[PDB]
Structure 1
Amino acid sequence: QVWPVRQVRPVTEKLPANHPLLTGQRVLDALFPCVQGGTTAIPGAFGCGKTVISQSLSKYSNSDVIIYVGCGERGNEMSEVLRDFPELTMEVDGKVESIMKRTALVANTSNMPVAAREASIYTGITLSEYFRDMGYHVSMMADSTSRWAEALREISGRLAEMPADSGYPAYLGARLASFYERAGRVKCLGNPEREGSVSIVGAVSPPGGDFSDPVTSATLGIVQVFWGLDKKLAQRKHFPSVNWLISYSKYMRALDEYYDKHFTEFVPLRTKAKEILQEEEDLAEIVQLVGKASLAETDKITLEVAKLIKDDFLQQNGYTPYDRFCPFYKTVGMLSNMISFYDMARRAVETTAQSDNKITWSIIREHMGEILYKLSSMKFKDPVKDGEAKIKADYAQLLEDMQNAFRSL
């Protein structure tokens, strides 16, 4: 069949999105969730990870079909996917299948014609709607939406139009908003009575890294998930470079009934982790000016556990076998043990601090350096070399090891 790319393909009904889109990142899957039928933006400066997140989500996720659009970006990255994806297999009926069998790519590299960047975007979402209509869950990646906005600006300039902010055409916000409205979960047209979805993840490339950029500022007025990347995390080789203070998801209430069935321990752990990270951000401004010596022992614990989470939970190397992909069992298990150690360390200090002889974080450090080293080492367990049973048994053994250490206090 043939379809006009500038027209939305019809559906019987649009539905609320109730099921997660799993990225395999610990940040993202725990802290800032997305859904089948969701809309996401990934703004960042150059070299933050917008491409590596887009490729990792394309390799390892619960979607049936992947559409990858690379408009205005490097030719070496389309060549990277064509090299990498045929060698990489998912497993089906006890048999392996290459992930290239479920994937389609649209290319228009940074040196190809500028007006064809618009054609790439509409081609990609029209291909995505066509597979949604078969009753599939599709993810569409747009490797930078800023490169389409920049094409609108040159054509608007040569048509000699009056601009909006930063030279962009006055219609830019309506173009973006009507593109992202093509996402969702649906009852399809026609009579085998099926359902499908499109999730859209759009990278944004704000010039100078400034999120007050008209394209970023229009986009955050539209999308339901915001993964804001930080160049100061990327320069530390802290990856994914997701700023946990500015980033958000609107879908965290939709996923309540999912976690309340499948991972009934999780939402309390997620809540405690956001509070520890927010408490550390309030302490750090005092610490920078006052010089750390004035802190209460519960604040020294809060800083150290926030450091443990920041360094050993929120951090993954995407190019090493144990952290390529993190399952949600490994993710919930790691967070459970870090939050468990926090609650035990806080209890030991808070219980004893009134007595003549009392616990301090420095006492806990000297008593528990092996448990602290074991907690930092939880990340290195490999989801395909080790079993699910072996990983969960090891994380249960760390819980006994730390309980026996706090019993010894």
Structure 2
Amino acid sequence: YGYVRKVSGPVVIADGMNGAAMYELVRVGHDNLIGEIIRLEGDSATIQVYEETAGLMVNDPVLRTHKPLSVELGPGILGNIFDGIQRPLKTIAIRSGDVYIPRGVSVPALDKDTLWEFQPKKIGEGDLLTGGDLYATVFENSLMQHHVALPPDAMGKVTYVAPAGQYSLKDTVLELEFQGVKKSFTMLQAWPVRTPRPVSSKLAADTPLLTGQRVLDALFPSVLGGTCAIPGAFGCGKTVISQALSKYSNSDTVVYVGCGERGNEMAEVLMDFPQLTMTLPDGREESVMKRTTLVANTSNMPVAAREASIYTGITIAEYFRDMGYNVSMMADSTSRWAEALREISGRLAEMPADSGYPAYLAARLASFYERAGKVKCLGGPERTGSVTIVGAVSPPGGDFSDPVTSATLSIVQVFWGLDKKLAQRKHFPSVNWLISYSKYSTALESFYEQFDPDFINIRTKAREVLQREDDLNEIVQLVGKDALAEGDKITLETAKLLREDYLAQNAFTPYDKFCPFYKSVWMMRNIIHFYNLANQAVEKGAGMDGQKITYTLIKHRLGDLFYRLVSQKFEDPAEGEPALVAKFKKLHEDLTAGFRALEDETR
């Protein structure tokens, strides 16, 4: 239909478009590299290649697909690997025995031929149906019940509903009548990669994410269907925190969409998806591959794919949230995504605003990060899901005033700022307890009250102790520990106890692999109770003794409790919640006995 005029890397001009649609996908050249329009100039158009562009020719045909970028939504997406162009990588590797990905390969996102069982939800002929009505369910695998739903822009009366049976994707199962037309339907539905899926209503979040890490779960809680921000450091986080979301998270599904990353890390993690099963179900061991989907685009991938992959991932997440399942989206991108925006702006010759980043970076980041929340779905029956976003930014070593970082912290409510010093200190969680913050605190008030009313005050006390330690660290560095008082001494002891027992979670050991909230709250309660008892003891300071003398005494006389407070970390959660609660209650009772007999002896 049209022919190329100008080729410069990802940018390819195609004269002869005349009537063409903004962001309409167009195939370029004999190999048919799929690309989207970015800049109309008249009859001419500008197309990002989305592939390797070497070897084009002037007058090579360019065809219009007339449709914007879309990803095939349907049964069979779970446990699959897709590029930003929604290409099943394992399917490509199997169909074509060559280890490479051939240039301009055209493979359907989901195999039509593959069979799947069906289960209508007592649907009757002639019933009026609306978009998003969960008329039937399909078990893609154990513990995964894909409830097929009507497309959002679809409604009518059910003239025909298929009986339950084995069907391929190309097969039609549902027929609707509306306004005197008949509309057939297959399981697979297409949805634009932009323009988020419609939502009946947005709801205020109520439940925390309850991640394995202690600091993430207590100091900086995050609600279900809420934004997150991590600096994407190595060693931990994108390896540790990500593993915690993958197997230790209460989210039903994980959509890992890493883009612009180290290739070997994704090779390893893809080798890890089939393995590393988690026995979350009572009677079965849920292999994480069932509850994950990898959108993998390594650094060698084309630049436009770096922009496309994020929207593909968020579209998949919105799809899953439509069924009511709570799904988490971890994104190792948005670090290199800004670089991709810089590149496309530079080729398009747009004028950058700050440090070479195009201005609409902030707007696009705001859109993507606001595409997540707790949502009441469309159709019947009434159901509710959520999407939780965890997106990386520049590594913590660089300045946190970087435009991408500044844009993210504007909209993101929870920043889990990792510390380079902590990483060098080999402190594995590496979460800084000063820069990090979770604005979601006020919402979780009811949850914390119903769980444990005393938790709020002890958390505030722990925060105050940490702040005091950080504040007077400068003083003790300058002046010295000689002037430190008994209150300062117990404050430093409690701060060290926190830094060692509480904020540190190795996660490579069964006792530290996962820390349930009940164990975390008890450990914090024990630490705060010990701090309070020490405060009261040094405050009493009577009987020709006490204060710093009392502090030294309780350091030596009550050294056993202080030592086993550290071992409280080693208490194995697998032993069972009632046993751990009993053990911690006994420890608390002994701590109360401590500083009470020490009170009786009056030093």
Establish whether TM, by shorter chain, passes 0.5: yes
| Pair 1:375-2:562 in alignment | no
8 Å CA contact 1:144–1:205 kept in 2: the answer is: no
Shift of 1:46: 5.4
Q: Deviations over 1:244-276 (max 9, x none)?
A: 111111111100011111222211111111111
Map of 2:379 onto structure 1: 190
Counterpart code for 1:312: D
Instruction: Give the equivalent residue in structure 1 for 2:166.
Output: none
Is 2:584 the counterpart of 1:395?
Answer: yes
What is the distance in 1 between the residues matched to 2:260 and 2:312? 15
> 1:51·1:143 contact (CA, 8 Å) conserved in 2?
no
Alpha-carbon distance between aligned partners in 2 of 1:136 and 1:47, rounded to the nearest angstrom? 30
Distance 1:76 1:383, change over 3 A: farther
Displacement of 1:11: 0.6
1:3 and 2:199 aligned: no
Establish whether residue 247 from structure 1 lines up as the match of residue 419 from structure 2.
no
1:236 to 395, 412, 425: 425
Q: Which residue of 1 aligns with 2:247?
A: 59
Distance 1:243 1:204 in 2: 16
Q: Which amino acid aligns with 1:35?
A: V
The 3-state SS of whatever aligns with 1:270 is helix
Alignment of 1:321-332 (within 5 A): 321-332=510-521
How much has 1:77 moved relative to structure 2?
2.5
Q: Give the equivalent residue in structure 1 for 2:329.
A: 140
Deviation at 1:117, TM superposition (A): 1.0
* TM-score (norm. length: structure 1): 0.95
CA deviation profile, 1:109-167 (whole Å, cap 9, x unmatched)? 12222221111101100000001011111110101311111111111111122112221
Any conservation in 2 of the 1:180–1:222 contact (CA below 8 Å)? yes
Equivalent residue runs for 1:4-403 within 5 Å: 4-43=192-231, 47=235, 49-85=237-273, 86-206=275-395, 208-352=397-541, 354-358=542-546, 359-384=549-574, 386-403=575-592
In 2, the alpha carbon distance for the partners of 1:256 and 1:183 equals 22
- Considering fraction of residues, name the structure with more helix: 1
Q: CA deviation at 1:25?
A: 1.2
2:553 partner amino acid: I
Measured on the aligned residues, the alpha-carbon RMSD in Å equals 1.6
Question: What is the deviation of 1:401?
Answer: 2.9
CA distance in 1, matches of 2:567, 2:271: 32
Contact 1:318–1:324, Cα closer than 8 Å, also in 2: yes
In structure 2, stretches of 5+ residues that fail to align are 1-188, 599-603
Aligned residues: 407
Letter in 2 for 1:43: P
AA matched with 1:293: D
* Structure 1, 341-350 or 106-115: larger mean CA deviation: 106-115
Structure 1 residues 196-216: Cα deviation after superposition (integer angstroms, max 9, x where no partner): 111101111248521111100
8 Å contact 2:232–2:332 — kept in the other structure? no
Aligned to 2:154: none
CA contact (8 A) 1:183 1:200 kept: yes
> CA-to-partner distance for each residue in 1:167-207, whole Å, 9 max, x for gaps?
11111101100001110111111121111111101111248
Runs (5+) with no aligned partner, structure 1:
none
Whole-Å Cα distance in 2 between the matches of residues 319 and 116 of structure 1?
35
**What do the CA deviations read for 1:377-400 (whole angstroms, capped 9, x no partner)?**
11112222x222222222122223
State the SS of the aligned residue for 2:552: helix
Moved more, 8-17 or 161-170: 161-170
Aligned 8 A contact 2:334 2:392 in 1: yes
For the residue of structure 2 that corresponds to 1:198, the secondary structure is: strand
> Compared with structure 1, are the counterparts of its residues 62 and 208 closer, same or farther at alpha carbon in structure 2 (3 Å cutoff)?
closer
Q: Distance in 2 between matches of 1:292 and 1:253?
A: 38
Question: Any idea what SS the aligned residue of 2:327 has?
Answer: strand
Give 1 or 2: higher strand fraction. Answer: 2
Structure 2: distance between partners of 1:132 and 1:36: 12
What secondary structure is seen at the aligned counterpart in 2 of 1:101? coil
Q: 1:80 to 1:321 in 2, by over 3 A?
A: farther
- The residue identity in structure 1 corresponding to 2:555 is R
* Structure label with greater radius of gyration: 2
Partner SS state of residue 387, structure 2: strand
2:147 corresponding residue in structure 1? none
CA deviation after TM superposition for structure 1 residue 322, in Å:
1.2
